[PDB]
Ligand binder design. Sequence first.
Ligand SMILES: Cc1ccncc1NC(=O)[C@@H]1C[C@H]1CF
Ligand SMILES: Cc1ccncc1NC(=O)[C@@H]1C[C@H]1CF
Lengths: 304, 304
Amino acid sequence: SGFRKMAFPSGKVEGCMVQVTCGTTTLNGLWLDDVVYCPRHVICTSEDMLNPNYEDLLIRKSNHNFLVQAGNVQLRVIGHSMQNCVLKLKVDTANPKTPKYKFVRIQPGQTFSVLACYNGSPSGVYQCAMRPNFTIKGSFLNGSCGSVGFNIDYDCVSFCYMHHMELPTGVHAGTDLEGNFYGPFVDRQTAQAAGTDTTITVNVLAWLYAAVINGDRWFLNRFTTTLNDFNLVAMKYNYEPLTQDHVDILGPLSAQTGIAVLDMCASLKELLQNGMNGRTILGSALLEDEFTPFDVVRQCSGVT
Amino acid sequence: SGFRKMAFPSGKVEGCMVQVTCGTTTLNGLWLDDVVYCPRHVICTSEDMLNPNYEDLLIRKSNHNFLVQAGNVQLRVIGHSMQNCVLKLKVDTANPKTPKYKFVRIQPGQTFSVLACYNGSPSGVYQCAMRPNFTIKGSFLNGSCGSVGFNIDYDCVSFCYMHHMELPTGVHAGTDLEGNFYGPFVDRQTAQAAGTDTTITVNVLAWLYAAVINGDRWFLNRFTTTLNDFNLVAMKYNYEPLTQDHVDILGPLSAQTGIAVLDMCASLKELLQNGMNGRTILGSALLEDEFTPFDVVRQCSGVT
Ligand SMILES: Cc1ccncc1NC(=O)[C@@H]1C[C@H]1CF
Ligand SMILES: Cc1ccncc1NC(=O)[C@@H]1C[C@H]1CF
């Protein structure tokens, strides 16, 4: 029993972190096989970041200009190429610590662990969700770029995020491992509008099931609702509309607890309309949306 | 910017996790140098746990009865001994992955990361605090015993906790790495009273400084208070009494922000007396006490 915002064990990712320096800029790189992946803005000076012409800036750089260091080891760069907003630095040595891995583009509402790094060194690990508006509310300071987001399935690390920037609002933006930004963001020091965000309804429902499993039951009521009625409430409270797909993914939790999905929706409806009345759910005084139904099942069963 | 409940990178601890089996019971062990540390209740059957006589139960066990497995490797046990509530299994091989480490007994109110494990395999990592009543509100299922709590200072892992049990209330109890329980708890399946808990005042104040550093300032007011006046409020709201030692540890945050400790105490006083009025602080709708002043400084500076 107990329920925590659990991150994946970061060990397999730590073994891949390196430091990449180009000119006066230093950030983090990800060393997998004989390739180091890093944000392409490593080639920019703070002056260039206002309106960078990356193709032009990269033309002035040669393999020997990219300094890649794994702790005390210096890696020899034998190739460089830009793919979208990432630089791929071919090195002459395959990382002996390369785990089994995939590059995945996650969907909004999905969760992942971030290994925050500075100068190629891991500082900490935290679990977070990709917001419906494609931002992440992370914890990143200058030098954290190149830190990655990932999920793990037994021995396989699925890399889904690489940190590139902090918006003027203090929210974070980044790319998949092919350098495609999540959201409308560009790697330029310019004001950028993040879309209207919403709360991840299916995640809140999953978290309400986790609360029941662990003993927090006060929010359960004598009511039920329909997808249509619930969605009218979800609309008013800036929650994502619930679909049959979301109901289907909640199936295992509905089955384990014996609380029908629409009955849980009616509890969520009353919580949205009345608030928590000074009470807590799993130690939170608000409705948590950073646990997916898969996260709840995994944590509640002890999956390693 | 941004502030998260960050755990230490668990890599150095993952390299130490092993599985320990004795008879029909399996749990986690910690392999450091040529010693495997695990909870002594690995020698008990669920029947023995009601009133175990550990000295007698251990006398029936021999080195060959303790099955220690590190992933696919079987370790040869050449000695066993009980120290308080831990068993120390001497093995014939030093763990090649042993990091620099210390065994420390933490104080209540201090924080640490837990690497939750099942069958010697890491499932996840989370940050938590040792409650003033010596319990931890963790996330532990059957088979999680032997999972450890730790802090890291550059390359040194300070092991401070080993998980032994879940109280009937769903809160968790465990020992330091010499097998001494934190709190009045015993390793027996019996109802056990955890003391009256309190909120860790210095941690809440540290978190209020982190909120200011990151832009959440609405709670700052035009008032100040004294240690005596604040402690009368702390008493009423089951908060730990604030001492000059706590004020001294808050010094760096008071210096960085320019908000005097007693001025922050007056903001905390108004928050305790009036609530949050439906607002949030660093994404929380309650007063967070799981970040120490050292945690706030570390996260806010990017310490690796
Ligand atoms: C200064 C900072 C802080 C935290 N995380 C990231 C950053 N850096 C940026 O925003 C880089 C300049 C842009 C490129 F899109
Ligand atoms: C069943 C469980 C669940 C989570 N964490 C731990 C446990 N196990 C226990 O409480 C063991 C029997 C006691 C020894 F003090």
